[PDB]
Amino acid sequence: RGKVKPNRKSTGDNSNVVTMIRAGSYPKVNPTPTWVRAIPFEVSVQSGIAF
Amino acid sequence: EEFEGRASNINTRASVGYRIPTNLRQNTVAADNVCEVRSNCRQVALVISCCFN
Amino acid sequence: NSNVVTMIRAGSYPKVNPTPTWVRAIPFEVSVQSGIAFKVPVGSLFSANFRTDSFTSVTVMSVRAWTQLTPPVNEYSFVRLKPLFKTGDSTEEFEGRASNINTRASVGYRIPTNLRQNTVAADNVCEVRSNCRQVALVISCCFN
Amino acid sequence: NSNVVTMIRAGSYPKVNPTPTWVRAIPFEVSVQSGIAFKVPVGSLFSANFRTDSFTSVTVMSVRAWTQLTPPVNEYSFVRLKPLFKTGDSTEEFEGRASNINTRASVGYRIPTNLRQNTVAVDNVCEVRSNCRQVALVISCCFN
Amino acid sequence: KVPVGSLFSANFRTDSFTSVTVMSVRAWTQLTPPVNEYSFVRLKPLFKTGDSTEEFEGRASNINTRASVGYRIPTNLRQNTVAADNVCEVRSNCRQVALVISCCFN
Amino acid sequence: NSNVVTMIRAGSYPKVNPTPTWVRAIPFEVSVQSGIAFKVPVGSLFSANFRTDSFTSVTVMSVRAWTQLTPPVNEYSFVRLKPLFKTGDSTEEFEGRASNINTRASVGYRIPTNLRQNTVAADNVCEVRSNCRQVALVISCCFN
Amino acid sequence: SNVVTMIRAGSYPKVNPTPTWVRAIPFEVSVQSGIAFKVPVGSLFSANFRTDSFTSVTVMSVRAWTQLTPPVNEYSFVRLKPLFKTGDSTEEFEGRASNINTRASVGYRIPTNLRQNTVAADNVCEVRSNCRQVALVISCCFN
Amino acid sequence: DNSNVVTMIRAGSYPKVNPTPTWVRAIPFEVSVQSGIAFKVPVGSLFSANFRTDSFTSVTVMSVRAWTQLTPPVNEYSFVRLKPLFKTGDSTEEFEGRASNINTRASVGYRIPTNLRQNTVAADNVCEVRSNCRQVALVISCCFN
Amino acid sequence: RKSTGDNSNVVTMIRAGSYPKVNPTPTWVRAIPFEVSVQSGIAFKVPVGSLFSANFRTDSFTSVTVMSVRAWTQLTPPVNEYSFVRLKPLFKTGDSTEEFEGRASNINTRASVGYRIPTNLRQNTVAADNVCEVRSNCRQVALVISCCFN
RNA sequence: AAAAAAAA
RNA sequence: AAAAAAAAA
RNA sequence: AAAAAAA
RNA sequence: AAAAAA
RNA sequence: UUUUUUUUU
RNA sequence: UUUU
RNA sequence: AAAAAAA
RNA sequence: UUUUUUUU
RNA sequence: UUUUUUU
RNA sequence: AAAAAAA
RNA sequence: AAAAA
RNA sequence: AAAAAA
RNA sequence: UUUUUUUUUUU
RNA sequence: UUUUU
């Protein structure tokens, strides 16, 4: 391989500094994606009629 | 269908739901309706599980 | 599977939240001048074009940058990123250069968990430096 | 293997259908302008150039796009795809950008099984946005 | 054109339903074919999102025997239909066709 | 699968074909005269009623025949098939009879791989002899 | 079983009064010195082979033997050049005799892709030899 | 894959050849039968250009099968009987088959044992055929030589 | 110990027997590369006679069994366009209506595509015959044909 | 199961 | 359910 | 295996 | 099998 | 794995 | 348990 | 790839 | 191994 | 996965 | 051993 | 069990 | 085997 | 990281 | 390897 550019990522899952991300080609993007949600809202009913 | 639930305690809410099968899961715009709600109470709370797209 | 509606034997009313969090990967562009750094504003993430205009704060996790336009004549594209923090800006210049003049230059940096706090629209994400006039950004963040 | 004809001990007249279905990937081009979306019509799939002039309906499964012409000067190619449905058009903008100016920009989306209904010539598949003047489309569908 | 309204009837206990999801449609010739002919029956599925062009045909190998054929509706096309809608077209050399439609009333 | 559209990370433009092949079974009927053989034309396969009017050649793999109408009085139905080729016509008479007067008479033959060349509309498939005046055919072939 | 037994026959089966029959047809041809002779396919259809009821045949392999003695001081040889309607070949499969009193043999096999039918007007192959006659054995499928 | 060109065969000495070999066949042909009368099936019916067998003068019959070719009389069911005949001695068996449906053919057959599988020339008779149908279809598994 | 021998330094004798079966003009499997001129919107029929040439050592053949055809664009495409190429197989028993198309995802990169002929359609073709039609936005296309000369 | 001819 | 067509992402 | 049905 | 990521 | 052709319980 |  | 089954 | 038999 | 009849 | 090719 | 580096 | 540390 | 044909010693 | 039954 080679030698180092010192990004001190301590123990991998426990770094306390910013670490360089070796990015590549521009990915597939979507600024307006989907969203699965559970929407809570109230509706008003009368006694004997449907709504 | 009239999927109905009744509260066994006068102080407790009455609950009931229904699941939509996969063959009937298309899109619905604002002008559309979801379901008809009937109750002896003046207001009903709804929690709708859905996918926004 | 089932072809008709089925009853859901629901119980007590559950814990709800009409305005939940959202983990996203926001793509947007910024203009970059030659020899000048551009402080990427956090407010660029809050927009109706990203469905995030309902938020006021966001937790940035990683930042990635690509060159959006062609470099000057005879040069290879490059891009730099300097992480900015309200508790103290950094001095790293995570630089990425292209090996083909016709190809973009990409680079990024990951924010440590200890430096993942909320940021408002007035704040800035990072400084960007490039020989190209535009930089394509994709920021992995947490809207709350 | 053999070298001459062989007799087939046939039985009752089977179930026949002179006009069956056909799963295809239809390649055709559309003209796109800068900053404006083009609604790709489903009628483009029905033509004698695709052996589908006998079908009146089709079930689209997945749509893929490719920039068919070169991007403007100093820019990289991109292409957006907004899925359209008769029960409700979407707002997604699946976008793919080219990392090389001389290379196409590719993106695509898959229609879920719950949304795979028939579409006639009057209907539209998706909106296509691109900085390139034309876009190549390969639509995996089921003609019926 | 076979109307969906033929499914909502008191003769089937279904006069309380207004919509139905059809799963599979199969048809049998109900009367004898013309002279010198073997029976046949065709079915062209119809949908509100797009009519089809398939002619699922079945023929009888015996002139005294019915001709039968059917088609299955995929899960992605199993939506509701009301009385104003049509299930499919029917073509045959016989003057009546018996249909046994497997559906889900809701 | 899911209930919403998903993004496809498409790559380079694929190798496409707008007019592909199609293997089918084509049901079509022919009229036969008493004591007279009838040559089956290959042009009967190419038709808008079979979605094959876009093809000009076809490779036939097998032929199957049924008596379409009733036989003469006191007789049981029979049908013969003599294969034909442009390199040389055959003399085989693959004959099938009915054991019940009301039942169709059926027979079929298979073409070996070495004899599976293309045939145009001007060519002929086989000869059909029968005491009935109509014979139904279901030919398994490859349109190209 | 030394007596007739009863066969419980069922429905009328599929019949074919004129089947295909696979054969190995032997015949001879006259050859001149230096001249190549085209072997006609029509020789395969003859009452001497029980094949006068056939009009087509699918050839699979051809084998050749010298039928007469070679010229003086020479050893027998024979060459075969395959011929097709889609295009003639230029191969000359040759076999020579290591004994002057012994025949010479050679043969070629027709691959599956080239095993189409041939009528009487066609030709099988070209034959060259120093002997004035050649004996051919053609493994073919009549139909 | 398969070979796509002509390939040389390394043939040797001239082999044993035979231009007029034998042929195991199943010959279909029809015969006309009257009511209450038995029709002797001639062996010469097997030798014809319609069967590619006019070059054979002898044949060794192995088994015979019959089917009624025409409809039976009114209100009756089809039947057919077969009586094996040999030059060394005619049998007296009447292998009969009846149709359980008036619209269906009647069928029956008989197998010849290897000891009785000699040759028969055109002037010989295979069997006798009785039936209430005016025509019978015959399928004879035999070995031509 | 003493059994090492496959590297000969001198001539050795060959104990030959009877005269073998010989063929002075045998077959040959090849991959013939050549180019053709293509016009815009016009289909060019590729002649089989292009295979029989002294430039390929195949000028002695008169027939060939084509197995597969591959095509690459030989010149640059028009301005703003990516290269493409199409192929339509042709047969003496009946021409095909398929147009196997392969485009270029890079304007500077060739466009490639090819098709394989099935065993049932691998017959001989003489010089007067044609292999396939070729369409391309480029003015020249390069071909490589895997074929069996005979 | 079946009289007849056989059969360590 | 032979080919053509998304992929186990 | 889907739907309706008892603890 | 949604949206993010050694 | 799916759409149409052929095989085999 | 009711269906094709 | 030809005769009488294919369980 | 010849003619009648025994749960599709 | 039964086998027996000429290239 | 020598002629397509394949990631 | 024979030879020739 | 650099510089930090249950 | 996997083949069709021209000769070809040796297990 | 090369030369010999």
Ligand SMILES: [Cl-]
């Ligand atoms: Cl300029």
Ligand SMILES: [Cl-]
């Ligand atoms: Cl030495």
Ligand SMILES: [Mg+2]
């Ligand atoms: Mg309450």
Ligand SMILES: [Mg+2]
């Ligand atoms: Mg009867």
